[PDB]
mmCIF file of N, CA and C in Angstrom:
data_model
loop_
_atom_site.group_PDB
_atom_site.id
_atom_site.type_symbol
_atom_site.label_atom_id
_atom_site.label_comp_id
_atom_site.label_asym_id
_atom_site.label_seq_id
_atom_site.Cartn_x
_atom_site.Cartn_y
_atom_site.Cartn_z
ATOM 1 N N UNK A 23 58.702 35.276 65.228
ATOM 2 C CA UNK A 23 58.281 35.612 63.812
ATOM 3 C C UNK A 23 57.017 36.372 63.873
ATOM 4 N N UNK A 24 56.015 36.087 64.681
ATOM 5 C CA UNK A 24 54.760 36.770 64.688
ATOM 6 C C UNK A 24 55.065 38.280 65.107
ATOM 7 N N UNK A 25 56.017 38.475 65.914
ATOM 8 C CA UNK A 25 56.477 39.734 66.149
ATOM 9 C C UNK A 25 57.091 40.484 65.057
ATOM 10 N N UNK A 26 57.760 39.597 64.307
ATOM 11 C CA UNK A 26 58.686 40.021 63.059
ATOM 12 C C UNK A 26 57.679 40.360 61.937
ATOM 13 N N UNK A 27 56.793 39.681 61.593
ATOM 14 C CA UNK A 27 55.972 39.915 60.463
ATOM 15 C C UNK A 27 54.987 41.108 60.671
ATOM 16 N N UNK A 28 54.668 41.198 62.015
ATOM 17 C CA UNK A 28 53.851 42.266 62.391
ATOM 18 C C UNK A 28 54.570 43.645 62.136
ATOM 19 N N UNK A 29 55.867 43.580 62.250
ATOM 20 C CA UNK A 29 56.635 44.795 62.025
ATOM 21 C C UNK A 29 56.767 45.151 60.563
ATOM 22 N N UNK A 30 56.536 44.006 59.804
ATOM 23 C CA UNK A 30 56.428 44.271 58.404
ATOM 24 C C UNK A 30 55.211 44.794 57.972
ATOM 25 N N UNK A 31 54.201 44.630 58.772
ATOM 26 C CA UNK A 31 52.836 45.134 58.430
ATOM 27 C C UNK A 31 52.762 46.775 58.511
ATOM 28 N N UNK A 32 53.631 47.177 59.471
ATOM 29 C CA UNK A 32 53.706 48.621 59.535
ATOM 30 C C UNK A 32 53.994 49.277 58.357
ATOM 31 N N UNK A 33 54.956 48.624 57.493
ATOM 32 C CA UNK A 33 55.282 49.060 56.198
ATOM 33 C C UNK A 33 54.266 48.479 55.151
ATOM 34 N N UNK A 34 53.411 47.614 55.598
ATOM 35 C CA UNK A 34 52.634 46.931 54.756
ATOM 36 C C UNK A 34 53.281 46.197 53.666
ATOM 37 N N UNK A 35 54.516 45.567 53.990
ATOM 38 C CA UNK A 35 55.072 44.920 52.840
ATOM 39 C C UNK A 35 54.424 43.818 52.137
ATOM 40 N N UNK A 36 54.423 43.956 50.882
ATOM 41 C CA UNK A 36 53.807 42.741 49.942
ATOM 42 C C UNK A 36 54.895 42.011 49.480
ATOM 43 N N UNK A 37 56.147 42.324 49.544
ATOM 44 C CA UNK A 37 57.267 41.767 48.948
ATOM 45 C C UNK A 37 58.429 41.561 49.671
ATOM 46 N N UNK A 38 58.945 40.314 49.795
ATOM 47 C CA UNK A 38 60.019 39.904 50.794
ATOM 48 C C UNK A 38 61.029 38.899 50.007
ATOM 49 N N UNK A 39 62.241 39.238 50.150
ATOM 50 C CA UNK A 39 63.256 38.162 49.704
ATOM 51 C C UNK A 39 63.785 37.511 50.922
ATOM 52 N N UNK A 40 63.472 36.189 50.998
ATOM 53 C CA UNK A 40 64.082 35.345 51.930
ATOM 54 C C UNK A 40 65.379 34.878 51.565
ATOM 55 N N UNK A 41 66.336 34.812 52.483
ATOM 56 C CA UNK A 41 67.666 34.267 52.118
ATOM 57 C C UNK A 41 68.155 33.386 53.324
ATOM 58 N N UNK A 42 67.737 32.094 53.260
ATOM 59 C CA UNK A 42 67.966 31.242 54.400
ATOM 60 C C UNK A 42 68.200 29.756 53.980
ATOM 61 N N UNK A 43 68.584 29.066 55.021
ATOM 62 C CA UNK A 43 68.976 27.590 54.765
ATOM 63 C C UNK A 43 67.750 26.705 54.557
ATOM 64 N N UNK A 44 68.055 25.536 54.013
ATOM 65 C CA UNK A 44 66.826 24.666 53.496
ATOM 66 C C UNK A 44 65.974 24.405 54.778
ATOM 67 N N UNK A 45 66.528 24.177 55.982
ATOM 68 C CA UNK A 45 65.741 24.159 57.240
ATOM 69 C C UNK A 45 65.005 25.343 57.594
ATOM 70 N N UNK A 46 65.757 26.566 57.554
ATOM 71 C CA UNK A 46 65.119 27.741 57.954
ATOM 72 C C UNK A 46 64.092 28.157 56.972
ATOM 73 N N UNK A 47 64.314 27.725 55.733
ATOM 74 C CA UNK A 47 63.246 28.075 54.627
ATOM 75 C C UNK A 47 61.955 27.346 55.070
ATOM 76 N N UNK A 48 62.118 26.061 55.612
ATOM 77 C CA UNK A 48 60.950 25.383 55.839
ATOM 78 C C UNK A 48 60.161 25.957 57.029
ATOM 79 N N UNK A 49 61.052 26.326 58.069
ATOM 80 C CA UNK A 49 60.264 26.756 59.192
ATOM 81 C C UNK A 49 59.660 28.181 59.031
ATOM 82 N N UNK A 50 60.383 28.954 58.112
ATOM 83 C CA UNK A 50 59.794 30.299 57.867
ATOM 84 C C UNK A 50 58.460 30.117 56.979
ATOM 85 N N UNK A 51 58.557 29.265 55.961
ATOM 86 C CA UNK A 51 57.282 28.930 55.170
ATOM 87 C C UNK A 51 56.134 28.531 56.014
ATOM 88 N N UNK A 52 56.518 27.665 57.035
ATOM 89 C CA UNK A 52 55.503 27.205 57.970
ATOM 90 C C UNK A 52 54.903 28.362 58.755
ATOM 91 N N UNK A 53 55.635 29.255 59.302
ATOM 92 C CA UNK A 53 55.091 30.252 60.106
ATOM 93 C C UNK A 53 54.396 31.195 59.240
ATOM 94 N N UNK A 54 54.712 31.370 58.065
ATOM 95 C CA UNK A 54 54.083 32.154 57.035
ATOM 96 C C UNK A 54 52.646 31.471 56.787
ATOM 97 N N UNK A 55 52.680 30.187 56.754
ATOM 98 C CA UNK A 55 51.320 29.544 56.650
ATOM 99 C C UNK A 55 50.465 29.869 57.849
ATOM 100 N N UNK A 56 51.141 29.642 59.026
ATOM 101 C CA UNK A 56 50.268 29.742 60.294
ATOM 102 C C UNK A 56 49.706 31.194 60.440
ATOM 103 N N UNK A 57 50.525 32.209 59.921
ATOM 104 C CA UNK A 57 49.956 33.602 59.949
ATOM 105 C C UNK A 57 49.225 33.763 58.626
ATOM 106 N N UNK A 58 49.242 33.018 57.749
ATOM 107 C CA UNK A 58 48.328 33.046 56.554
ATOM 108 C C UNK A 58 48.775 34.086 55.506
ATOM 109 N N UNK A 59 50.055 34.649 55.613
ATOM 110 C CA UNK A 59 50.507 35.522 54.777
ATOM 111 C C UNK A 59 51.031 34.972 53.371
ATOM 112 N N UNK A 60 50.420 33.701 53.032
ATOM 113 C CA UNK A 60 50.648 33.145 51.661
ATOM 114 C C UNK A 60 49.507 33.283 50.682
ATOM 115 N N UNK A 61 48.788 34.216 51.180
ATOM 116 C CA UNK A 61 47.546 34.583 50.326
ATOM 117 C C UNK A 61 47.972 35.434 49.145
ATOM 118 N N UNK A 62 47.143 35.578 48.000
ATOM 119 C CA UNK A 62 47.479 36.397 46.901
ATOM 120 C C UNK A 62 47.649 37.772 47.366
ATOM 121 N N UNK A 63 48.532 38.487 46.701
ATOM 122 C CA UNK A 63 48.772 39.928 47.120
ATOM 123 C C UNK A 63 50.092 40.031 47.784
ATOM 124 N N UNK A 64 50.709 38.893 48.289
ATOM 125 C CA UNK A 64 52.102 38.755 48.620
ATOM 126 C C UNK A 64 52.960 38.070 47.537
ATOM 127 N N UNK A 65 54.205 38.283 47.790
ATOM 128 C CA UNK A 65 55.104 37.506 46.830
ATOM 129 C C UNK A 65 56.493 37.237 47.555
ATOM 130 N N UNK A 66 57.015 36.287 47.096
ATOM 131 C CA UNK A 66 58.410 35.832 47.695
ATOM 132 C C UNK A 66 59.502 35.440 46.784
ATOM 133 N N UNK A 67 60.834 35.509 47.232
ATOM 134 C CA UNK A 67 61.856 35.132 46.437
ATOM 135 C C UNK A 67 62.896 34.417 47.275
ATOM 136 N N UNK A 68 63.084 33.175 47.001
ATOM 137 C CA UNK A 68 63.921 32.232 47.746
ATOM 138 C C UNK A 68 65.460 32.201 47.197
ATOM 139 N N UNK A 69 66.254 32.868 47.838
ATOM 140 C CA UNK A 69 67.582 33.190 47.350
ATOM 141 C C UNK A 69 68.528 31.949 47.607
ATOM 142 N N UNK A 70 68.318 30.863 46.841
ATOM 143 C CA UNK A 70 69.334 29.681 46.741
ATOM 144 C C UNK A 70 69.049 28.716 45.638
ATOM 145 N N UNK A 71 69.944 27.814 45.484
ATOM 146 C CA UNK A 71 69.680 26.887 44.424
ATOM 147 C C UNK A 71 68.705 25.650 44.696
ATOM 148 N N UNK A 72 68.278 25.794 45.911
ATOM 149 C CA UNK A 72 67.487 24.598 46.423
ATOM 150 C C UNK A 72 65.944 24.799 46.306
ATOM 151 N N UNK A 73 65.506 25.776 45.513
ATOM 152 C CA UNK A 73 64.187 26.090 45.336
ATOM 153 C C UNK A 73 63.252 25.038 45.014
ATOM 154 N N UNK A 74 63.633 24.278 44.020
ATOM 155 C CA UNK A 74 62.914 22.985 43.752
ATOM 156 C C UNK A 74 63.195 21.996 44.916
ATOM 157 N N UNK A 75 64.290 22.068 45.642
ATOM 158 C CA UNK A 75 64.530 21.103 46.739
ATOM 159 C C UNK A 75 63.550 21.356 47.870
ATOM 160 N N UNK A 76 63.088 22.536 48.047
ATOM 161 C CA UNK A 76 62.321 23.015 49.062
ATOM 162 C C UNK A 76 60.941 22.261 48.972
ATOM 163 N N UNK A 77 60.252 22.182 50.091
ATOM 164 C CA UNK A 77 58.886 21.481 50.032
ATOM 165 C C UNK A 77 57.950 22.685 49.877
ATOM 166 N N UNK A 78 57.700 23.203 48.624
ATOM 167 C CA UNK A 78 56.663 24.252 48.420
ATOM 168 C C UNK A 78 55.334 23.893 48.256
ATOM 169 N N UNK B 5 73.614 54.205 68.747
ATOM 170 C CA UNK B 5 72.115 54.287 68.373
ATOM 171 C C UNK B 5 71.509 55.476 69.192
ATOM 172 N N UNK B 6 72.096 55.645 70.451
ATOM 173 C CA UNK B 6 71.537 56.593 71.386
ATOM 174 C C UNK B 6 71.877 58.048 70.873
ATOM 175 N N UNK B 7 73.041 58.127 70.221
ATOM 176 C CA UNK B 7 73.420 59.487 69.638
ATOM 177 C C UNK B 7 72.528 59.776 68.552
ATOM 178 N N UNK B 8 72.114 58.679 67.743
ATOM 179 C CA UNK B 8 71.368 58.809 66.659
ATOM 180 C C UNK B 8 69.921 59.223 67.149
ATOM 181 N N UNK B 9 69.426 58.745 68.238
ATOM 182 C CA UNK B 9 68.168 59.237 68.664
ATOM 183 C C UNK B 9 68.223 60.591 69.119
ATOM 184 N N UNK B 10 69.355 61.074 69.610
ATOM 185 C CA UNK B 10 69.431 62.377 70.194
ATOM 186 C C UNK B 10 69.266 63.403 69.115
ATOM 187 N N UNK B 11 69.768 63.156 67.821
ATOM 188 C CA UNK B 11 69.524 64.207 66.695
ATOM 189 C C UNK B 11 68.283 63.832 66.115
ATOM 190 N N UNK B 12 67.585 62.736 66.525
ATOM 191 C CA UNK B 12 66.291 62.348 65.876
ATOM 192 C C UNK B 12 66.296 62.330 64.397
ATOM 193 N N UNK B 13 67.381 61.691 63.861
ATOM 194 C CA UNK B 13 67.546 61.480 62.423
ATOM 195 C C UNK B 13 66.614 60.392 61.756
ATOM 196 N N UNK B 14 66.318 60.596 60.615
ATOM 197 C CA UNK B 14 65.471 59.698 59.790
ATOM 198 C C UNK B 14 66.128 59.109 58.551
ATOM 199 N N UNK B 15 66.967 59.904 57.909
ATOM 200 C CA UNK B 15 67.646 59.475 56.770
ATOM 201 C C UNK B 15 69.257 59.686 56.928
ATOM 202 N N UNK B 16 69.914 58.685 56.629
ATOM 203 C CA UNK B 16 71.507 58.945 56.624
ATOM 204 C C UNK B 16 72.222 57.825 55.836
ATOM 205 N N UNK B 17 73.376 58.332 55.257
ATOM 206 C CA UNK B 17 74.262 57.446 54.721
ATOM 207 C C UNK B 17 75.242 56.810 55.793
ATOM 208 N N UNK B 18 75.657 55.533 55.474
ATOM 209 C CA UNK B 18 76.348 54.923 56.408
ATOM 210 C C UNK B 18 77.630 54.125 55.842
ATOM 211 N N UNK B 19 78.730 54.977 55.646
ATOM 212 C CA UNK B 19 79.970 54.355 55.140
ATOM 213 C C UNK B 19 80.618 53.474 56.210
ATOM 214 N N UNK B 20 81.145 52.420 55.616
ATOM 215 C CA UNK B 20 81.872 51.473 56.515
ATOM 216 C C UNK B 20 82.951 50.673 55.799
ATOM 217 N N UNK B 21 84.077 50.549 56.630
ATOM 218 C CA UNK B 21 85.053 49.418 56.304
ATOM 219 C C UNK B 21 84.480 48.097 56.736
ATOM 220 N N UNK B 22 84.878 47.075 56.104
ATOM 221 C CA UNK B 22 84.413 45.755 56.392
ATOM 222 C C UNK B 22 85.241 45.290 57.868
ATOM 223 N N UNK B 23 86.389 45.798 58.098
ATOM 224 C CA UNK B 23 87.371 45.279 58.821
ATOM 225 C C UNK B 23 86.818 45.224 60.409
ATOM 226 N N UNK B 24 86.224 46.113 60.802
ATOM 227 C CA UNK B 24 85.722 46.023 62.307
ATOM 228 C C UNK B 24 84.477 45.268 62.442
ATOM 229 N N UNK B 25 83.994 44.736 61.334
ATOM 230 C CA UNK B 25 82.875 43.791 61.342
ATOM 231 C C UNK B 25 81.531 44.533 60.895
ATOM 232 N N UNK B 26 80.489 43.788 60.611
ATOM 233 C CA UNK B 26 79.304 44.389 60.139
ATOM 234 C C UNK B 26 78.266 44.449 61.271
ATOM 235 N N UNK B 27 78.637 44.214 62.467
ATOM 236 C CA UNK B 27 77.729 44.224 63.619
ATOM 237 C C UNK B 27 77.008 45.493 63.736
ATOM 238 N N UNK B 28 77.722 46.546 63.671
ATOM 239 C CA UNK B 28 77.149 47.828 63.730
ATOM 240 C C UNK B 28 76.098 48.063 62.606
ATOM 241 N N UNK B 29 76.464 47.444 61.449
ATOM 242 C CA UNK B 29 75.517 47.542 60.424
ATOM 243 C C UNK B 29 74.225 46.844 60.734
ATOM 244 N N UNK B 30 74.376 45.585 61.245
ATOM 245 C CA UNK B 30 73.209 44.804 61.558
ATOM 246 C C UNK B 30 72.322 45.450 62.566
ATOM 247 N N UNK B 31 73.094 46.183 63.482
ATOM 248 C CA UNK B 31 72.384 46.948 64.536
ATOM 249 C C UNK B 31 71.648 48.153 64.039
ATOM 250 N N UNK B 32 72.501 48.895 63.212
ATOM 251 C CA UNK B 32 71.762 50.174 62.729
ATOM 252 C C UNK B 32 70.562 49.868 61.924
ATOM 253 N N UNK B 33 70.713 48.827 61.054
ATOM 254 C CA UNK B 33 69.615 48.362 60.145
ATOM 255 C C UNK B 33 68.340 47.818 61.144
ATOM 256 N N UNK B 34 68.801 47.274 62.090
ATOM 257 C CA UNK B 34 67.761 46.699 63.075
ATOM 258 C C UNK B 34 66.878 47.845 63.714
ATOM 259 N N UNK B 35 67.522 48.883 64.143
ATOM 260 C CA UNK B 35 66.908 49.857 64.717
ATOM 261 C C UNK B 35 66.311 50.720 63.578
ATOM 262 N N UNK B 36 66.692 50.693 62.458
ATOM 263 C CA UNK B 36 66.151 51.362 61.176
ATOM 264 C C UNK B 36 64.800 50.864 60.876
ATOM 265 N N UNK B 37 64.654 49.469 61.047
ATOM 266 C CA UNK B 37 63.283 48.921 60.802
ATOM 267 C C UNK B 37 62.362 49.412 61.679
ATOM 268 N N UNK B 38 62.543 49.486 62.944
ATOM 269 C CA UNK B 38 61.465 49.895 63.873
ATOM 270 C C UNK B 38 61.320 51.480 63.838
ATOM 271 N N UNK B 39 62.344 52.196 63.541
ATOM 272 C CA UNK B 39 62.323 53.613 63.561
ATOM 273 C C UNK B 39 61.979 54.241 62.182
ATOM 274 N N UNK B 40 61.579 53.309 61.208
ATOM 275 C CA UNK B 40 61.287 53.852 59.809
ATOM 276 C C UNK B 40 62.531 54.651 59.182
ATOM 277 N N UNK B 41 63.686 54.420 59.616
ATOM 278 C CA UNK B 41 64.902 54.976 59.151
ATOM 279 C C UNK B 41 65.132 54.531 57.685
ATOM 280 N N UNK B 42 65.883 55.435 56.897
ATOM 281 C CA UNK B 42 66.264 55.126 55.518
ATOM 282 C C UNK B 42 67.636 54.975 55.344
ATOM 283 N N UNK B 43 68.318 53.956 55.878
ATOM 284 C CA UNK B 43 69.704 53.706 55.732
ATOM 285 C C UNK B 43 70.281 53.549 54.227
ATOM 286 N N UNK B 44 71.397 54.223 54.112
ATOM 287 C CA UNK B 44 72.169 54.116 52.893
ATOM 288 C C UNK B 44 73.595 53.698 53.170
ATOM 289 N N UNK B 45 73.748 52.456 53.647
ATOM 290 C CA UNK B 45 75.135 51.872 53.818
ATOM 291 C C UNK B 45 75.866 51.715 52.649
ATOM 292 N N UNK B 46 77.202 51.850 52.766
ATOM 293 C CA UNK B 46 78.105 51.476 51.568
ATOM 294 C C UNK B 46 79.573 51.008 51.968
ATOM 295 N N UNK B 47 80.015 49.943 51.343
ATOM 296 C CA UNK B 47 81.273 49.359 51.683
ATOM 297 C C UNK B 47 82.399 50.158 50.967
ATOM 298 N N UNK B 48 82.985 51.140 51.704
ATOM 299 C CA UNK B 48 83.990 51.959 51.039
ATOM 300 C C UNK B 48 85.373 51.165 51.162
ATOM 301 N N UNK B 49 85.356 50.148 52.023
ATOM 302 C CA UNK B 49 86.734 49.627 52.419
ATOM 303 C C UNK B 49 87.352 48.696 51.498
ATOM 304 N N UNK B 50 86.596 48.222 50.486
ATOM 305 C CA UNK B 50 87.096 47.390 49.540
ATOM 306 C C UNK B 50 87.781 48.027 48.367
ATOM 307 N N UNK B 51 87.725 49.340 48.331
ATOM 308 C CA UNK B 51 88.338 50.135 47.248
ATOM 309 C C UNK B 51 89.897 50.096 47.302
ATOM 310 N N UNK B 52 90.459 49.802 46.145
ATOM 311 C CA UNK B 52 91.897 49.750 46.005
ATOM 312 C C UNK B 52 92.526 51.136 46.334
ATOM 313 N N UNK B 53 93.795 50.972 46.960
ATOM 314 C CA UNK B 53 94.471 52.231 47.336
ATOM 315 C C UNK B 53 95.160 52.798 46.167
ATOM 316 N N UNK B 54 95.374 52.037 45.092
ATOM 317 C CA UNK B 54 96.081 52.455 43.961
ATOM 318 C C UNK B 54 95.420 53.730 43.337
ATOM 319 N N UNK B 55 94.093 53.775 43.383
ATOM 320 C CA UNK B 55 93.380 54.743 42.802
ATOM 321 C C UNK B 55 92.279 55.358 43.795
ATOM 322 N N UNK B 56 92.739 55.339 45.044
ATOM 323 C CA UNK B 56 91.890 55.766 46.098
ATOM 324 C C UNK B 56 91.573 57.257 45.830
ATOM 325 N N UNK B 57 90.834 57.714 44.863
ATOM 326 C CA UNK B 57 90.501 59.054 44.598
ATOM 327 C C UNK B 57 89.404 59.095 43.535
ATOM 328 N N UNK B 58 89.541 58.385 42.471
ATOM 329 C CA UNK B 58 88.479 58.270 41.566
ATOM 330 C C UNK B 58 87.187 57.790 41.961
ATOM 331 N N UNK B 59 87.238 56.798 42.788
ATOM 332 C CA UNK B 59 86.157 56.156 43.377
ATOM 333 C C UNK B 59 85.195 57.084 44.104
#
């Protein structure tokens, strides 16, 4: 993941649409927390019906 | 991908049938991320043969 989001930094992406399973959503959000890219200036879109179901 | 690197391309269309699988698509996109490529993939293969001309 850290290798992955670093790659996003080269494009300096501020905008990402995740499309993953309830569990993968959790792990991804967690890693985003650890790398801290949940700060203002980023944005996300969770492509599933479980958006409320997720532990946001 | 090697052939791609040989021409040192940066932008290209990528027409594809679904039938052989999308693995090549996943691959070319994968290399596209690191190489700053601008892929334009399109699924030509779903088109009906009844009017395979207009599309």
